[PDB]
Design an enzyme around this catalytic site. Structure first.
Site, short mmCIF file in Angstrom:
data_model
loop_
_atom_site.label_atom_id
_atom_site.label_comp_id
_atom_site.label_asym_id
_atom_site.label_seq_id
_atom_site.Cartn_x
_atom_site.Cartn_y
_atom_site.Cartn_z
N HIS A 179 0.81 -1.21 0.00
CA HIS A 179 0.00 0.00 0.00
C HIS A 179 0.86 1.29 0.00
O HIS A 179 0.30 2.39 -0.19
CB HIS A 179 -1.08 -0.01 1.10
CG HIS A 179 -0.55 0.26 2.47
ND1 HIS A 179 -0.61 -0.69 3.46
CD2 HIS A 179 -0.13 1.43 3.01
CE1 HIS A 179 -0.15 -0.10 4.56
NE2 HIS A 179 0.15 1.18 4.33
N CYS B 81 3.32 1.64 9.49
CA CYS B 81 3.26 0.51 8.58
C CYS B 81 4.62 0.09 8.11
O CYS B 81 5.49 0.94 7.91
CB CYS B 81 2.35 0.84 7.40
SG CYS B 81 0.74 1.46 7.90
N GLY C 146 2.05 6.06 9.65
CA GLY C 146 3.48 5.99 9.36
C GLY C 146 4.17 4.78 9.96
O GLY C 146 5.33 4.53 9.63
O1 LIG Z 1 -4.32 1.88 8.64
C1 LIG Z 1 -3.37 2.48 8.15
C2 LIG Z 1 -3.32 2.86 6.68
C3 LIG Z 1 -4.15 1.89 5.86
C4 LIG Z 1 -5.51 2.07 5.68
C5 LIG Z 1 -6.28 1.11 5.04
C6 LIG Z 1 -5.69 -0.04 4.54
C7 LIG Z 1 -4.33 -0.20 4.71
CL1 LIG Z 1 -3.57 -1.65 4.12
C8 LIG Z 1 -3.55 0.74 5.36
N1 LIG Z 1 -2.26 2.75 8.85
C9 LIG Z 1 -2.07 2.84 10.17
N2 LIG Z 1 -1.64 1.73 10.76
N3 LIG Z 1 -1.68 1.55 12.09
C10 LIG Z 1 -2.11 2.51 12.85
C11 LIG Z 1 -2.62 3.73 12.36
C12 LIG Z 1 -3.06 4.79 13.20
C13 LIG Z 1 -3.52 5.95 12.67
C14 LIG Z 1 -3.57 6.13 11.29
C15 LIG Z 1 -3.15 5.13 10.45
C16 LIG Z 1 -2.65 3.91 10.95
#
Ligand SMILES: O=C(Cc1cccc(Cl)c1)Nc1nncc2ccccc12
Ligand SMILES: O=C(Cc1cccc(Cl)c1)Nc1nncc2ccccc12
Lengths: 304, 304
Positions: A41, A145, A143
């Protein structure tokens, strides 16, 4: 003495963290040998996380679009490929800090340490477990990820998790290092509810044994039970069924304490049926399920 | 989202761990620049830990009696000196992995990460706090002495603790890196009871703010209190008195949540007076006091 939620020392993994940027998205990558692994992603804009066709989005990306930086120095990307939900970016330089490593896919109930990272830089380390519903209860912000989960056996790092997302409930989902998600989750911004977060019974029992080893013994009773009777109680309390495989794994702890596994099950049954009565066990007022039997022996034996 | 007991990444400190042996005792040392720091009780036999005269015992020791090994390679000791309860072994080689560092003496209520080590090798990392009675609730076995506690600010490691001993109650005592014990403890095998382990109020409040930030809000009530009224309750429940300095430190968390500090105090007063009623806060069934206000902001902001 004492018993803590202990993570593996994170040094070997810190040396593998890098920053990956594609377009306007920046996340973490894991640099092992001449390959950088990161969530696919990274190629998405917010506008297409709703329903991404990763193969189509990836056609518009070339090696020079993946900016990989290790500390303050840029890595040259000479190849890229998608394996399930991860991208593998081939770089021209082997990571000189690559530890001995393996990629493992863990089962629910297994624990691991996470090195939470932002911008390729490590922020902290904590311990968690693969829940029976295939989520993890981590601590992750935007961030994070691409941060990874791992275990260490002497000098070998077994990487088991790469963070991809948070569910609307604040629990976390991700993949093994082959890019396959744990559980049914998909890397898309859509309705993904988690199943029942069942308690990991064999880990609760391991932690009760840790409590006895460390002197907290008030909960030991005069009773015993059978696997089938115990499992009737486990079902009622949303605990995983205990099998003879779990009894076998608790053998070393049973031998150390002299407390038969089924006697410890009867102690756990009484705690489930009566609660703690305002008392604590190893500084917790609830039954802890994120220590495996292996973790308890390791912590109570000082394996390095 | 999510909130975990998070330790600092331990890499910078792992590179400083060494094994120190004197006679038949082996423990850990911390190698910074050309000096190795370790507990002075490394010079003692079991027969003289009962009432040791460290100055007299040290007269029978020469530089060649202190065996210092970093990984599998031996370090040459060219000087030794005792500073309070630590020995400083001058070696002929500066540790090439020495990070930017400071030695700090922390106050009760402050948290730090511990890298538990055995034989100069790291076993695990966990987070703990200097208790109001100057003990720490660690996880340490025989041979863990000389393991250290620290905090990290960007690239600087501030070492605050070196482990020396376990009290008969299974709690831990040790020194700062100048060798001065925290609290009244002495490095001797004698009666040393700990004082009241009071709850660190400002940290409980910080963790209630972390709970609100992370969506656990059931405990917020319609009440407020004053510092003097709150402190009447804190006294009754063996909580540290809250001062205006503590209210000031909670300012950023109050601003983030829009919850006035004294309103959060009234929420905490109700939780103290009524208990949790079988409910949980951030996965805990008790009020957690080993997150400082700085830790909550750091974890909820992703500082690297
Ligand atoms: O969830 C996502 C981005 C995302 C959204 C939809 C699908 C996919 Cl694969 C990835 N990233 C994050 N990950 N862990 C904690 C987070 C806390 C706050 C914001 C973002 C976070
Ligand atoms: O307590 C000691 C040795 C010691 C005794 C008296 C005085 C002094 Cl300065 C040092 N070391 C240990 N430290 N932490 C946990 C331990 C668990 C088991 C055994 C030993 C442990």
């Amino acid at each position: 003495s004492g018993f803590r939620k202990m993570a593996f020392p994170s040094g070997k993994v810190e040396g593998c963290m890098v920053q990956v940027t594609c377009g306007t998205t920046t996340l973490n990558g894991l640099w092992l040998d001449d390959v950088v692994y990161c969530p696919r992603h990274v190629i998405c804009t917010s506008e297409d996380m709703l329903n991404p066709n990763y193969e189509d989005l990836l056609i518009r990306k070339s090696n020079h679009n993946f900016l990989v930086q290790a500390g303050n120095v840029q890595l040259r990307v000479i190849g890229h490929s998608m394996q399930n939900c991860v991208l593998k970016l081939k770089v021209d330089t082997a990571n000189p800090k690559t530890p001995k490593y393996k990629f493992v896919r863990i089962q629910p109930g297994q624990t691991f340490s996470v090195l939470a990272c932002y911008n390729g830089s490590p922020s902290g380390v904590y311990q968690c477990a693969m829940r029976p519903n295939f989520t993890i209860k981590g601590s992750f912000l935007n961030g994070s990820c691409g941060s990874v989960g791992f275990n260490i056996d002497y000098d070998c790092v077994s990487f088991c998790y790469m963070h991809h997302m948070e569910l609307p409930t604040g629990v976390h989902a991700g993949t093994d290092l082959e890019g396959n998600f744990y559980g049914p989750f998909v890397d898309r911004q859509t309705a993904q509810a988690a199943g029942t977060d069942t308690t990991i019974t064999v880990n609760v029992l391991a932690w009760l044994y840790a409590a006895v080893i460390n002197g907290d013994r008030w909960f030991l009773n005069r009773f015993t039970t059978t696997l089938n009777d115990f499992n009737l109680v486990a079902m009622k309390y949303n605990y995983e069924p205990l099998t003879q495989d779990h009894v076998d794994i608790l053998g070393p702890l049973s031998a150390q304490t002299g407390i038969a596994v089924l006697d410890m099950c009867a102690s756990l049954k009484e705690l489930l049926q009566n609660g703690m009565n305002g008392r604590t066990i190893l500084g917790s007022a609830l039954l802890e399920d994120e220590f495996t039997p292996f973790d308890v022996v390791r912590q109570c034996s000082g394996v390095t």
